Amino acid sequence: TPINLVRDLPQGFSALEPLVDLPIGINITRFQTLLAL
Amino acid sequence: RLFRKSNLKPFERDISTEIYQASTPCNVEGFNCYFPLQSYGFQPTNG
């Protein structure tokens, strides 16, 4: 996005474009972000 | 796998060795709770 705005999210619109689908399946849950330091 | 708590969904894998409680709860072999897996007697003599 061109996202810069001022504060919080703006009133705009756009959409994703999928990249890949890999075969994990196997009951996926508990997504966890990897924060840096 | 001969025992499982709940039926697996289509295209699902169960490599876990979770012991099943097939009515007396267990915490564990011989009777009423077994190793989930069971082996095949594949022998040439088998029909």
UniProtKB/Swiss-Prot annotation, chain A:
The gene is S. Changing I3V: In strain: Omicron/BA.2.75. The chain holds residues 208 to 244 of 1273 of the full protein. This is Spike protein S1. Attaches the virion to the cell membrane by interacting with host receptor, initiating the infection. The major receptor is host ACE2. When S2/S2' has been cleaved, binding to the receptor triggers direct fusion at the cell membrane. When S2/S2' has not been cleaved, binding to the receptor results in internalization of the virus by endocytosis using host TFRC and GRM2 and leading to fusion of the virion membrane with the host endosomal membrane. Alternatively, may use NRP1/NRP2 and integrin as entry receptors. It comes from Severe acute respiratory syndrome coronavirus 2. Binds to host ACE2. RBD also interacts with the N-linked glycan on 'Asn-90' of ACE2. Cleavage of S generates a polybasic C-terminal sequence on S1 that binds to host Neuropilin-1 (NRP1) and Neuropilin-2 (NRP2) receptors. Interacts with host integrin alpha-5/beta-1 (ITGA5:ITGB1) and with ACE2 in complex with integrin alpha-5/beta-1 (ITGA5:ITGB1). May interact via cytoplasmic c-terminus with M protein. May interact (via N-terminus) with host bilirubin and biliverdin, thereby preventing antibody binding to the SARS-CoV-2 spike NTD via an allosteric mechanism. Glycans are attached at N27. It comes from the Viruses.
